[PDB]
């Protein structure tokens, strides 16, 4: 009567946790690496400026930049709008799922207020020692 079956499940768990554990450590790798790409991109599209001589150069350069500004700014704008468009597209999709299942996990928009841990830190500053998460507390001996 499948008496041993119990060990099978524990494995999946052992593995699942071996997975998540793997995930997390990989998660921050991609994260920092990602950033690296960000500073390189910026590394060339706007490298450590070096102010020219003065007369024509400083004026010229200034005009150069100022024009690019309206340029980059417009691009920045268009981008922001494509984002708006996108966030919009998923909100609708974040609907077409609600009224078809109900309140599902991981809504894309996520309405979150400040955490209690935040409020606590913010108000007591130094004396806020409780790594609160879920761990209840029953007397230890």
């Amino acid at each position: 009567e499948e008496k041993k079956r119990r060990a099978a499940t524990a494995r999946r768990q052992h593995l699942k946790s071996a997975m998540l554990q793997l995930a997390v450590t990989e998660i921050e790798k991609e994260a920092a690496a990602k950033e690296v790409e960000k500073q390189n991109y910026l590394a060339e599209h706007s490298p450590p400026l070096s102010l020219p001589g003065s007369m024509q150069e400083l004026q010229e350069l200034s005009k150069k930049l100022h024009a690019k500004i309206d340029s980059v700014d417009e691009e920045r704008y268009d981008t922001e709008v494509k984002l708006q468009k996108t966030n919009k597209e998923l909100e609708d999709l974040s609907q077409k799922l609600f009224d078809l299942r109900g309140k599902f996990k991981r809504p894309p928009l996520r309405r979150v207020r400040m955490s209690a841990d935040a409020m606590l830190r913010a108000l007591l500053g130094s004396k806020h020692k409780v790594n609160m998460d879920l761990r209840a507390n029953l007397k230890q001996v």
């Binding site: 997975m19 793997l22 995930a23 108000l123």
Partner: protein, 159 residues
């Protein structure tokens, strides 16, 4: 009061201890309950700028005695609900991220192949049988992949 029960049951003396200190600061006069005004002051200290409507709504969320104010009890309730929501969000976020890492592929799934890789990618020792086993257990809609929903489910419980 029933809520204020489990609520206080949930927290620890440590918790209460601090949530009190915190509550006290909310309460100016020191009477015994945060008013629609006493709250406004703290909220701004916390970097917000609520409106009369907003404030009350935030008040009467845990005001069981229709007082229009919040006592250290209704407060603990409030802190609890938040405690909860916070931990929930953090969880789903992490898992959500894990799914993207395991997905590596874009297709929004996790096929037996990647499952193997990621699994094999762990230091743990595993043979194909294990991998396909975990797939069969996880894939509930028996379509071969593992959708985000299932991933939430399968990872439900692990850390």
């Amino acid at each position: 009061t029933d809520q204020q029960a489990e609520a206080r049951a949930f927290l620890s003396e440590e918790m209460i201890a601090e949530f009190k200190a915190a509550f006290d600061m909310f309460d100016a006069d020191g009477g015994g309950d945060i008013s629609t005004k006493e709250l406004g002051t703290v909220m701004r200290m916390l970097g917000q700028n609520p409106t009369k409507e907003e404030l009350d709504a935030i008040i009467e969320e845990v005001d069981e005695d229709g007082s229009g104010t919040i006592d250290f009890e209704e407060f603990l309730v409030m802190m609890v609900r938040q405690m909860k929501e916070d931990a929930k969000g953090k969880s789903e976020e992490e898992l959500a991220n894990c799914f993207r890492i395991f997905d590596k592929n874009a297709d929004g799934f996790i096929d037996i192949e990647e499952l193997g890789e990621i699994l094999r990618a762990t230091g743990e020792h595993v043979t194909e049988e294990d991998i396909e086993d975990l797939m069969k257990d996880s894939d509930k809609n028996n379509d071969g992949r593992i959708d985000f929903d299932e991933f939430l489910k399968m990872m439900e419980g692990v850390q």
